[PDB]
Amino acid sequence: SWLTEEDIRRWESGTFYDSYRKLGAHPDEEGTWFCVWAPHADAVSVLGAFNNWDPEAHQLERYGAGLWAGYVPGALPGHAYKYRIRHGFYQADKTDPYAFAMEPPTGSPIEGLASIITRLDYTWHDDAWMQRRKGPASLYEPVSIYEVHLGSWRHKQPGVSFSYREIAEPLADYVQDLGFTHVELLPIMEHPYYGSWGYQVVGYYAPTFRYGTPQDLMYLIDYLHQRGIGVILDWVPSHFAADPQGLVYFDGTTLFEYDHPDWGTYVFDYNKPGVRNFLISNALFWLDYYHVDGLRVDAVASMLYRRENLEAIDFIKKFNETVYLHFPEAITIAEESTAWPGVSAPTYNNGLGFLYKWNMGWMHDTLDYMRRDPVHRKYHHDTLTFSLWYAFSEHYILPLSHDEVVHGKGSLWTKMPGDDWQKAANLRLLYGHMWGHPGKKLLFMGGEFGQHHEWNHDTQLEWHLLDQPYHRGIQAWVRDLNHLYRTHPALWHDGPEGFEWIDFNDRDQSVICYLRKHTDRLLLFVLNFTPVPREHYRVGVPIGGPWREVLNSDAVAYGGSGMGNFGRVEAVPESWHGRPFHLELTLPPLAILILEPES
Amino acid sequence: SWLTEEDIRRWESGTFYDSYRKLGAHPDEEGTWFCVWAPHADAVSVLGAFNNWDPEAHQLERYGAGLWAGYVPGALPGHAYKYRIRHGFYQADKTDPYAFAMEPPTGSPIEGLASIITRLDYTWHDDAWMQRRKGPASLYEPVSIYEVHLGSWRHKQPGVSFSYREIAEPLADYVQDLGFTHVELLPIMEHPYYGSWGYQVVGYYAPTFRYGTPQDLMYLIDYLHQRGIGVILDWVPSHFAADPQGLVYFDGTTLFEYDDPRMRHHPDWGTYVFDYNKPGVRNFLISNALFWLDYYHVDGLRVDAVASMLYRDRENLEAIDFIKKFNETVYLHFPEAITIAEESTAWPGVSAPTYNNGLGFLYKWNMGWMHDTLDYMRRDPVHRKYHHDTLTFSLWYAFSEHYILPLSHDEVVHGKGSLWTKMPGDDWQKAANLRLLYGHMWGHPGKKLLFMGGEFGQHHEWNHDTQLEWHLLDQPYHRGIQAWVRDLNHLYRTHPALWHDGPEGFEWIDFNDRDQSVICYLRKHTDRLLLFVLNFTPVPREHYRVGVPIGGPWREVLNSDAVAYGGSGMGNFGRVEAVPESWHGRPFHLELTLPPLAILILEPES
């Protein structure tokens, strides 16, 4: 009896969310237990070195709910194995969907990827971090996400990436100095084509071999946690990879497939309980076995539609419901490119049950506005100001992801208009406004230097640009912005109550003044979107008295001209912007001023 | 650095007797170390699934002494591997000489054999046995060897032998029931040809796959020890198998074989013989001896065809010195192991210590006794008169060496006929004679060896492709013989008069009743004495008087003619009182009745 009768009963229910405990390959010192789901199979057999790859040596026995199981003495960790499933006249060799590790036998993932028997034994030293993780409580705490593709981040030599362990100290070193709150990792699950960035997934339960063993990854997360950094894993429940030995036609017929235009026939059949187990158990698998703090679901709209797909909608709702039940302090983030309501809302209120939504609306408006020249920004003022009508519809994360710096879209730097100074000024201004705008922050690697080139995964980021002034200044600006974020709670509350307008109708001079509030604390943000310094510019404020200049984008330390109020600004009790007191300031070129009352 | 610089120097001296610690394949926690001896190779490469069999993927590095070593990440236990050795213009694939396990990808050993990485972790439960193994002192203890071919003993299904594990409990129960002290196993080292019985060896460090894994063999050896059985392994340092991927011309040259062409051809072994001149060959062999006693706890090693080593036709000093240092290192590192030799010449001091100019074996097969005894009883009782001197003169040679009286598989093959077949008359008399032969062999000085199947007197010559005729245990004549051997071994195990095979342990009572073909002798240790009276004729003898040293009541401890063994039931019946009359130059005498073709063993009464 390998499988409990409760397990088979739970499998038929679609309630087996620990299903990884029994499905796949589970090592024992004498031999490995094998468990695979193949309901439309006449037979299933394990092939490996442990039986001369002979199909009649070890035929699993069929249990309930199309669950096949068998024991193989001498099947050992690190050995490659394979399932042979027979559908009537035809038989085929398949990979394990629940494989915990895979490696290419030829040496090339594109030729062969092979399931390898693995033990996940690892002793964690991240005790302290997880007793204090937040997440749902992070709605009122600073969340600043550094989005990363591990292979592309840094190289030991050209074309050779860092191991999971080797990356740990450099990424943890870099992320801490930057002040970032989390790292979001582009999908780590095993994928054949490196150029996929990981979104075509074959081994949902296996971290990719390219960076090391599964424990190597657990150590990385363990390490980062000790350093106080969170780990978000991009996850792909929307579609699986088109690999013939993969999930496609597993038992000889449709199984994980429907019995989408983006990926037709690679869409998961959320109707089947067996599919639902596989997907949700895997979500928990990462939160359980790898202590992951958050999971990000991409192209959620592709699941919602085909007009709405209710199979998927109930699945998403149950996914979010299940995660927070087993891990009350996890975080789930969604990217949904339609105006689907209540993504970030709880299922009990007819929401999808996510904690966070990428504000892709904001990103489009923001980028479109700053692609424009300051001379012309006059005519597009509403694109800038109107982001706040939709800024509280969900619990949002402001997003500047890899998808924006690929396929000829241009690096964030490349997008900004004018000569190099204005390009650097524009990006420092952009981030300043993004850090001020309500919502958490996500920046994809290389945006912190404002690197010239589009993200090229086949190479390492242009760190050499960190030697030159303009790019080193932007890195300093992001670090300093991140310091302001964590220090001041006025930015922690992305609620409507947190934000108040100071002035939004200066279209001619292309300026924005706004307030970000929590209780006592106020933070005043004044933005000049034209390369013209503004003098005697008055900005209304609630409080009188001494005001300080907390940050100036135009500081020479950032590559700025250096026009500034430099603190020591005294409010004048003359009504401005419908406010009791006013500040008389100097607005630097293409810059953001951040000011708070002196205390 | 895989090899210590001490490691290189010891290999160069031919004094590296732990060489298995470093040569061969040694799994690591993330990969495998490989080390091969190929002095005249220009390049050596490891091939396996762990590198997609690419010869340039993992090219071993040359260390000193012609040893090559290298590490391969991802090479794991259970992987099959291969050495690609390049001899100048030519390249060839070879198996690992130090392979600790071999398996055929084909599934036929002859068609192919492959080196598979193995880890030898095994947890032993034989503490009590090995702390009490008496080894050299066994000369003063009862040693009864049951010689066994594992594949031939019993078949779990027709044409299918028992695994190492499966054989353990059935065999141990059998050997315990019959009272043998040790089992000698025909060579278990990996061999291509099953019909070779194991004497053509390819994998000296690997137990044959036919019955299971190395640990499978370890369970059996462990098991037998827990049951109180000793395990002697047959070992073949005389020659290696004539197998092309094996040790023949390993590095592209003569390597394990003699470099000299004239030396290379030897008449018994043809081209393949071990060059005992080479220190590397000396390492490989002596390390292998210790390897078996070390990792497999074997109690003894028996070397065959020692004459083929000693002579070339004459003396091979290479072989003689190798033989001597083989024995010296064995007893130095494992003082309680046992080494046995069979030599078809009358070479002196086989059983003698090297420091006395002996070869250093503990035991020698008394093949003189075997031929002599077999020659005599092969003949008809009417004629045994004329060959009485063949029987009695056997003891002129019984104390020349420490001897093991051996009847072997080699005797029951090749048209020589079963021991049963060898004996004269109809089945009753044949069974009687076989009881006599075992009767005298247990009486004759020396340890005892009987090959499997002889204990019931099976008809057909031993056929390796089949299992023994156990069905004859249903018929009475053969079930009686098996009972007789059991009783003989019980007498041997319990009576110390039979333990001391020196001339002091034997006294002649009378040998000149040549006419009636009767012999009486004494097996005595200290006060204890056992009287053996043997009638080699089917007529029983009445009122036959036998001299005795001590006078008093004597009891009959064993009667071959007892009905339980398949006999007449004729006997003294015990309560034999020595008659204070002189006979055979002795103070007292026993008046006995001698059953047909029978052996009597008698003890004074206490």
Structural resolution in Å? 2.9
Residue pairs spanning A and B at CB distance below 8 A = 21
The pair of structure tokens assigned to A465 is 């640009």
**Method of determination used here:** X-ray
d(CA A584, CA A598): 16
Half-sphere exposure of A584 (CA within 13 A, CB side): 6
> Which residue among A49, A79, A105 places its CB closest to the CB of B52?
A105
Burial label for A56, CB within 10 Å (0-12, 13-18, 19+), is exposed
> Which residue among B52, B76, B107 places its CB closest to the CB of A106?
B52
In a mutational test of the A interface, the residue from B72, B76, B123 whose CB has the highest number of chain A CBs within 10 Å is B76
> Which residue among A49, A105, A107 places its CB closest to the CB of B78?
A49
> In 10 A of CB B423, how many CB atoms?
23
d(CA A535, CA A528): 11
Supply the DSSP symbol for A288: H
From the list A432, A472, A419, the residue with the least C-alpha distance to A553 is A432
Q: Where are the alpha helices (DSSP H) in B397-503?
A: 419-422, 427-443, 476-494
The pair of structure tokens assigned to B489 is 């071994």
d(CA A63, CA B278): 62
Q: Do residues A563 and A522 lie in contact, with contact meaning Cβ atoms separated by under 8 Å? A: no
For helices A469-487 and A420-436, angle between their N-to-C axes, nearest 10 degrees:
10
The two beta strands, A294-297 and A331-334, are parallel
Cβ distance of B49 and A49 shorter than 8 Å: yes
Inform me whether the C-beta atom of residue A73 falls under 8 Å from chain B C-beta atoms: no
Inform me whether the C-beta atom of residue A268 falls under 8 Å from chain B C-beta atoms: no
From the list B233, B211, B234, B228, the residue with the least C-alpha distance to B150 is B211
Number of residues assigned to chain A: 599
> Which residue among B52, B78, B80 places its CB closest to the CB of A79?
B78
CA separation, residue A246 to residues A55, A252, A277, A366, B171 (Å): 19, 12, 18, 41, 50
Cβ distance of A50 and B77 shorter than 8 Å: no
- Residue A316, H or E segment: helix A310-326
> Which residue among B49, B74, B78 places its CB closest to the CB of A50?
B78
From the list B307, B328, B329, B331, the residue with the least C-alpha distance to B319 is B307
In a mutational test of the A interface, the residue from B28, B52, B219 whose CB has the highest number of chain A CBs within 10 Å is B52
Q: Do residues B265 and B271 lie in contact, with contact meaning Cβ atoms separated by under 8 Å? A: yes
In a mutational test of the B interface, the residue from A30, A47, A50, A76 whose CB has the highest number of chain B CBs within 10 Å is A76
Q: Where are the alpha helices (DSSP H) in B149-213?
A: 150-153, 164-178
d(CA A398, CA A143): 10
What is the least distance, in Å, from the CA of B79 to any CA of chain A? 7
Q: Do residues B74 and B46 lie in contact, with contact meaning Cβ atoms separated by under 8 Å? A: no
Contacts of B14 (CB under 8 A, 6+ apart): B278, B279, B280, B281, B282, B283
Cβ distance of A76 and B78 shorter than 8 Å: yes
> Which residue among A74, A78, A107 places its CB closest to the CB of B76?
A78
What is the least distance, in Å, from the CA of B48 to any CA of chain A? 11
d(CA B556, CA A401): 102
Torsion region of B212: left, alpha or beta (phi above 0 gives left; psi -120 to 50 gives alpha)? left
Q: Do residues A239 and A261 lie in contact, with contact meaning Cβ atoms separated by under 8 Å? A: no
The pair of structure tokens assigned to A567 is 């603190």
Q: Do residues B78 and B98 lie in contact, with contact meaning Cβ atoms separated by under 8 Å? A: no
Inform me whether the C-beta atom of residue A78 falls under 8 Å from chain B C-beta atoms: yes
d(CA A72, CA A54): 13
> Which residue among B49, B78, B107 places its CB closest to the CB of A105?
B49
What is the least distance, in Å, from the CA of B47 to any CA of chain A? 13
d(CA A571, CA A522): 14
**CA closest to B48 among chain A residues:** A105
Query: Phi/psi at A233 (nearest 5 deg)?
Result: -105, 120
CA separation, residue A183 to residues A129, A137, A237, A455, B473 (Å): 15, 18, 20, 17, 78
What is the least distance, in Å, from the CA of B104 to any CA of chain A? 9
The one catalytic residue among B234, B251, B299, B304: B304
Inform me whether the C-beta atom of residue A108 falls under 8 Å from chain B C-beta atoms: no
Strands (E), A336-491: 356-358, 396-400, 440-444
Catalytic residue at B342?
yes
Q: Do residues B522 and B539 lie in contact, with contact meaning Cβ atoms separated by under 8 Å? A: no
List the catalytic residues of A.
298, 335
Contacts of B396 (CB under 8 A, 6+ apart): none
Cβ distance of A52 and B77 shorter than 8 Å: no
Cβ distance of B80 and A49 shorter than 8 Å: yes
d(CA B462, CA B452): 9
Contacts made by residues A157-161, CB under 8 angstroms, sequence distance 24+ = A158/A459, A158/A460, A159/A458, A159/A459, A161/A210, A161/A211
Query: Phi/psi at B215 (nearest 5 deg)?
Result: -65, -30
Inform me whether the C-beta atom of residue B123 falls under 8 Å from chain A C-beta atoms: no
What is the least distance, in Å, from the CA of A10 to any CA of chain B? 36
CA separation, residue B411 to residues A177, B154, B246, B407 (Å): 86, 20, 30, 7
What is the least distance, in Å, from the CA of B122 to any CA of chain A? 12
Inform me whether the C-beta atom of residue A79 falls under 8 Å from chain B C-beta atoms: yes
d(CA A551, CA A459): 35
Inform me whether the C-beta atom of residue B104 falls under 8 Å from chain A C-beta atoms: no
Inform me whether the C-beta atom of residue B80 falls under 8 Å from chain A C-beta atoms: yes
What is the least distance, in Å, from the CA of A77 to any CA of chain B? 9
Inform me whether the C-beta atom of residue B79 falls under 8 Å from chain A C-beta atoms: yes
Torsion region of A376: left, alpha or beta (phi above 0 gives left; psi -120 to 50 gives alpha)? alpha
d(CA A156, CA A159): 8
Name residue B339's beta-bridge partners. B301
> Which residue among A52, A76, A107 places its CB closest to the CB of B77?
A76
The two beta strands, B599-604 and A294-297, are unpaired
Inform me whether the C-beta atom of residue A599 falls under 8 Å from chain B C-beta atoms: no
d(CA A517, CA A596): 10
From the list B277, B275, B228, the residue with the least C-alpha distance to B256 is B275
Name residue A67's beta-bridge partners. A37
Residues of chain A contacting B122 with CB distance shorter than 8 Å: none
End-to-end CA distance of chain A: 70
From the list A540, A522, A518, A561, the residue with the least C-alpha distance to A429 is A561
Cα B66 to chain centroid, rounded: 35
Supply the DSSP symbol for A84: E
From the list B310, B255, B253, B250, the residue with the least C-alpha distance to B280 is B255
Burial label for B526, CB within 10 Å (0-12, 13-18, 19+), is exposed
Structure-derived torsion over alpha carbons of residues A11, A15, A19, A23, reported in degrees to the nearest 10: 20
Residues of chain B contacting A52 with CB distance shorter than 8 Å: 105, 107
What is the least distance, in Å, from the CA of B75 to any CA of chain A? 9
Structure-derived torsion over alpha carbons of residues B311, B313, B318, B324, reported in degrees to the nearest 10: -10
Cβ distance of A52 and B78 shorter than 8 Å: no
Q: Do residues B311 and B272 lie in contact, with contact meaning Cβ atoms separated by under 8 Å? A: no
In the structure, how many helices (H) and strands (E) does chain B have? 15, 29
DSSP B475-495: SHHHHHHHHHHHHHHHHHHH-
Cβ distance of B80 and A106 shorter than 8 Å: no
Cβ distance of B80 and A50 shorter than 8 Å: no
Inform me whether the C-beta atom of residue A105 falls under 8 Å from chain B C-beta atoms: yes
The pair of structure tokens assigned to A482 is 């991140």
Question: Can you tell me whether residue A521 is helix, strand or coil?
Answer: strand
The structure tokens 């003698």 sit at B352
Question: Can you tell me whether residue B51 is helix, strand or coil?
Answer: helix
From the list B428, B485, B476, B499, the residue with the least C-alpha distance to B451 is B485
Inform me whether the C-beta atom of residue A57 falls under 8 Å from chain B C-beta atoms: no
Inform me whether the C-beta atom of residue A76 falls under 8 Å from chain B C-beta atoms: yes
Residues of chain B contacting A107 with CB distance shorter than 8 Å: 52
Question: Can you tell me whether residue A338 is helix, strand or coil?
Answer: coil
> In 10 A of CB B158, how many CB atoms?
7
d(CA B178, CA B242): 38
Q: Do residues B503 and B572 lie in contact, with contact meaning Cβ atoms separated by under 8 Å? A: no
Contacts of A377 (CB under 8 A, 6+ apart): A369, A384, A510, A529, A530
**CA closest to B30 among chain A residues:** A78
Q: Do residues A581 and A553 lie in contact, with contact meaning Cβ atoms separated by under 8 Å? A: no
d(CA A227, CA A304): 38
Angle, CA of B575, B576 and B578, to the nearest 5°: 135
The structure tokens 């997609």 sit at B52
d(CA B122, CA B564): 44
d(CA A349, CA A462): 46
The structure tokens 């994360």 sit at A397
What is the least distance, in Å, from the CA of A52 to any CA of chain B? 7
Query: Phi/psi at A67 (nearest 5 deg)?
Result: -105, 120
Catalytic residue at B304?
yes
Cβ distance of A76 and B80 shorter than 8 Å: no
**CA closest to A79 among chain B residues:** B76
Query: Phi/psi at B394 (nearest 5 deg)?
Result: -55, -30
Cβ distance of B78 and A107 shorter than 8 Å: no
Angle, CA of B261, B262 and B267, to the nearest 5°: 115
Torsion region of A198: left, alpha or beta (phi above 0 gives left; psi -120 to 50 gives alpha)? left
End-to-end CA distance of chain B: 70
Q: Do residues A575 and A530 lie in contact, with contact meaning Cβ atoms separated by under 8 Å? A: no
The pair of structure tokens assigned to A294 is 């958050």
d(CA B599, CA B485): 13
Q: Where are the alpha helices (DSSP H) in B296-347?
A: 306-310, 317-333
Query: Phi/psi at A376 (nearest 5 deg)?
Result: -95, -15
Cβ distance of A49 and B105 shorter than 8 Å: no
